[PDB]
Symmetry: D2
Subunit: 404 residues, 4 copies
């Protein structure tokens, strides 16, 4: 049928077959899975190998939370294996850390690092700072004019006006001190604020847009070139994130007894320190690294991020880490280790954390959703878990490299 199909669709789509809808070519089709099915069939005929989609699964997945929220042009889902590393003994608690990865040995190695920490009295961590950022670029007629705006934003009165505009957008919108940089007639303004338990990009962007609108009322000659002028900086390496922080700034530490270094990690404290200095400090320095003073923080960040519904593209900055090691204890034979991660971009509400499987992994760690009594606590706790697990990862890989 050709003309009859248009009449039935006006009434609904359940009476029409799959081949009839394809003949003509989201909201038109009744069920979400059927929409995926038709899209897959249309796609298959465009590929040189239509049987490509055979092993890409799609059936029985809950698309209701994905459509119009997380993904478009959906043709199915990608299963990433999830392993568990733990217990991670952190701040007098014990965590079972979910890790989504396809790299062999990663989960097992991280698990060994956890064991080392666990037999060593446990790890301790602190959140040092919290605030997601957006760094728009604005332009004025002259550099003297951009200078005037910078000076105006630095006054208590000027900042209060911008803060009021920013804070009016959301419950959690609370503008911190502005960071500004001039480049001739350009002005780069770094807006920073806490965002409850959300990663905060949407919240900060909404606050930024309103703040820039209010700024335009005081400086009508100002042009808003882009709401992001890469001064944030989001999803690109930047020294500003390393020095100023972005999202959660975290530190974590543990002391590993000499006995544990030998038995669990198959190495010595002295060997670990020498590798740390010459690989993570000198090596990264020779390579021209900004913020990459670690062995494989990225491995742990990415694995946790994928498992817990985070924005995995943010591993670029979230993996920023300096790993430090020194001799400790009365006999100077125990291993003190610390990991400092100034730019963990993380959340427990919104985005991929709205999906049930991702919520399962968040629930494992007891951080799923918003914390009503203490806004931000779940996201802060997750950041502490990430930093702690990174340290476990550092211990085991460094031990492997030290032992050869």
């Amino acid at each position: 049928p050709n003309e009859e199909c248009l009449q039935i669709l006006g009434n609904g789509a359940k009476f029409l077959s799959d081949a009839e809808i394809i003949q003509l070519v989201e909201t038109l089709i009744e069920t979400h899975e059927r929409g995926v099915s038709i899209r897959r069939q249309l796609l298959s005929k465009k590929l040189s190998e239509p049987s490509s989609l055979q092993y890409l699964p799609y059936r029985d997945y809950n698309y209701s939370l994905v459509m119009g929220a997380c993904c478009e042009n959906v043709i199915g889902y990608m299963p990433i294996p999830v392993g568990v590393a733990g217990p991670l003994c952190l701040d007098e608690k014990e965590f079972q850390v979910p890790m989504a990865t396809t790299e062999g040995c990663l989960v097992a190695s991280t698990n060994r690092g956890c064991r080392a920490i666990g037999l060593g009295g446990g790890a301790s961590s602190r959140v040092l700072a919290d605030g997601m950022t957006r760094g728009p670029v604005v332009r004025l007629p002259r550099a003297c004019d951009s200078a005037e705006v910078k000076a105006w934003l630095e006054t208590s009165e000027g900042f209060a006006v911008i803060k009021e505009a920013f804070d009016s957008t959301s419950r959690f919108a609370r503008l911190q001190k502005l960071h500004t940089s001039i480049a001739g007639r350009n002005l780069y303004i770094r807006f920073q604020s806490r965002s409850g338990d959300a990663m905060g990009m949407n919240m900060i962007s909404k606050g930024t847009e309103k703040a820039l609108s209010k700024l335009h009322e005081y400086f009508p000659e100002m042009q808003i070139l882009a709401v992001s002028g890469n001064y944030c900086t989001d999803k690109k390496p930047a020294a500003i994130n390393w020095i100023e922080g972005r999202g959660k700034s975290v530190v974590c530490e543990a002391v590993i007894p000499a006995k544990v270094v030998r038995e669990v990690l198959k190495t010595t404290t002295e060997a670990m320190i020498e590798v740390n200095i010459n690989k993570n400090l000198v090596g990264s320095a020779m390579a021209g690294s900004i913020g990459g003073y670690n062995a494989h923080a990225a491995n742990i960040v990415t694995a946790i991020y994928i498992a817990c519904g985070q924005d995995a593209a943010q591993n670029v900055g979230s993996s920023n880490c300096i790993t430090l090691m020194e001799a400790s204890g009365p006999t100077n034979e125990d291993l003190y280790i610390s990991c400092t991660m100034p730019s963990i971009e993380i959340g427990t509400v919104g985005g991929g954390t709205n999906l049930l499987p991702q919520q399962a992994c968040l629930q494992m760690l007891g951080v799923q959703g918003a914390c009503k009594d203490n806004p931000g606590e779940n996201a802060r706790q997750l950041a502490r878990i990430v930093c702690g697990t990174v340290m476990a990862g550092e211990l085991s890989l460094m031990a492997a490299l030290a032992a050869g």
Copy 2:
């Protein structure tokens, strides 16, 4: 033995290979895990049934408790090098696939994109130590001689069919010597292959310099999974460039902006903005978004998005009336493969097959990985085009 015993019998015995069957092994491990969690019901919506664990166990993941479904969208057709690609993207970020898809449309109506692979070579950068700086200097000089390099190359190349050692890059720090081994790796990403070659090459170097200590097979000089200027300047894995010209009409109708607006935003965001932020290699809008999405979909090492997303996006006016938009994306360090690791799994192979790059290329070793790298760079450009337009239009 264990087949006749019940699930509760194995658990109470404790309170990997014994279970024999894969799924029941995952089931029991989940049950053991549940009693360690504050809420045992946490695992309820973490799926595990009916998944092919045979290719995972002892290869891709350990302590497996299930799988994480990441939604896969499609952006395309991507008109690249006279071909058309349907690009799979695994993401939970709303608007990403749709925005990338709009960028593809702009390129498609603009006559298509053209790309080139400029370099190919995975790297490993061990740190070795000598008694003195004079000694490490001697090793550096020895490695720089034709005969010295030939001996190391012979040892390196003996480890694998695809192992073919390129020119060594060496840096001294006192008595420390950092040696960057580089080689092609067929269609594999190559980390295991390069590491195996490196280990044998260092063993051979130790024959000539017996006082040399191999401190670490990776001294962060590679550099793997950390931001590093060396990857930006020297390249790592695949170095790729891609370009297109977008007609003024297409910029207006599809991208909802102007060529002039796009150029001004690109200069002041991607160049000046990144400069003010102190970026090394981050001269782009969101290359990382596209890299990560393709990487997860195509069984790549997503942790390598750190360096793989290195990108400089350039825009200028083009055409007779100087009103068309020329765009280029240059990505010097795409770390990518079509065999090994996550690319061994069937669902991941499905997305690779969509692009026609699955597995090793028999007739032309490396062609599939090179093609995928070109697709990544091209898709990045599509993403750049759409996001920049969104920012320029406000």
Copy 3:
């Protein structure tokens, strides 16, 4: 003629000869400074493979009184650096004659051409955006939990007030700004920042830092001061922190050069200049992996002015940080807009080499010599503006030379 060692000891300076004093040094004070230099020169010459090496190194008639125990030790003479003049530099409705000490041919003359282009373009305008010298000590506590506690303490209003009071007590020019702190495990890096009148401020900030750390130690007795400089300042090394946060004076300068002037004086076009600027100073520096080096030769101008005006020339490492921007301007879109932004000019008009008279002569040329009584810091800020303006002149001329080929 030469007297025995025992007969020379009973007398000892003016009565003794030069040959006799040398014998006393070899056996194992002087009336004038110059003779003291002469003796040291003679002692040194014998140690050298070529005994007449110091022949053309001048030393006579120089005022060593302001140098000894203040600027240099083990003095064997002076190094004359040729000084040229570039100008007039038309900046902020004033005209400056800029002294430049250099041995690079074409530098002064090229910079002079840049000044000519600015002068025929209606002049330059500049602004000082920030002012504060920094010192970044490293302190260490028993644990990261402890260093975190100190960071939190320093971030409180009452915690900062106590530290500010201690810091500001060391000098009348001291005014401690908001602290920048960074943790690295049990390490804490604290970036102290304050204005310093017309001085570059390193000595002043360090003194304030020591006092502030002493006060902090009263509240945290377990804190170890590892180094008064933990490279977090950062002084005399390249550092993104200086680029992003600023150090000393942060300055911006701008001008519009008419199309006619670009053509006649600079021998190029506005279009060519912009194209070279984008692809050299932005894309080129990006490809090179530069942090803060988004310019043609700011270092040339900074160094030349610094040597001429008694600045710390080693500070050109950070002081030369610059981003040069160019775009089309004017009603016909044919004029050249240029800006230079320099966030970390480390500069002073009192103390160090600026205490010497020849160096003061060059400072007097620009009208910035000494401390401004009416407005503390005004002379140092003015000199910073002159540097940024002269950098822009240098940028115009070299970029034109490169564009024209």
Copy 4:
């Protein structure tokens, strides 16, 4: 009594008279009336010094304070070597105090190192570092690489075209043609392997070559021009945008210099006995190492440094550079340094120190090294001029002296910081 401008031109125009018969005021009047250019006063007047004197008098009138130049010296200086070579619009000279640090015990030789500075304690502190090295058996150094660079930017119509040029330059045949063109510009020109980087249709080409005992910027730039001209024969659609595209990189901080090297790449080392660390440096080996790790490595890391893993290499580099007629603006990259320290010896109480400097840009011929006072400081170190028997040896020796003196400076300042 002053004379009219028309009469003064006839006196100056005459061969048997010149500016000798004209007064200062009459020459001043001729420049102000635009008959005589101010930048050519040295050639037009009988002596160079009077030419400088006239320019000073011209300048003094323009200033708000007419007596500003009073204490800026100019008399009795040899301008003949400066004019048309080192400086323009000369109004005198700036005396920088020169101090001596040493003996520096380096490679079984002893050096007395000249340092031009106005920073109090710098020479004396560096001298203390030398003394520590001397009692420690001396320093050893090695030159690892030698090659000045220039990094032009060229442009092609498309990225596919720039890719083609990159591939062409990477072929043995393509490189041989370019090397032939480059090397034909100077006797010392020996082009090393090219480093190329694409940015869309842009191509950045890093030319590197030894340059005898010269710093080599002019030599390399001349070779680059000829090589690009030859490349343009094969690729006529190529546009040479700039002979320097900041890919060199000259006088700006750049990771490329840190990683690839520029000029002379040098390493130096010494072992200081525990007794010497205690008595001379007023500290301990343990304290030195702890400060070095947390300041020069961790501290510089927290600050986001590329190449600045040291205490004050820039102080030593700048002081030697000014004293020895180097380009002091090149201390930006020349001061790149990583300082390393560890425990050494049978009892693990002695201090091993190393300094690695990948990008020392230095020469002993050309530029400011042509001036006699600067040559005096070069003669002190026995490195003045070109080494005929071994081209580059004098410049290489100076680079080793710089690295060794840096290490001396590092020892002393780090000791001061460790002791408090």
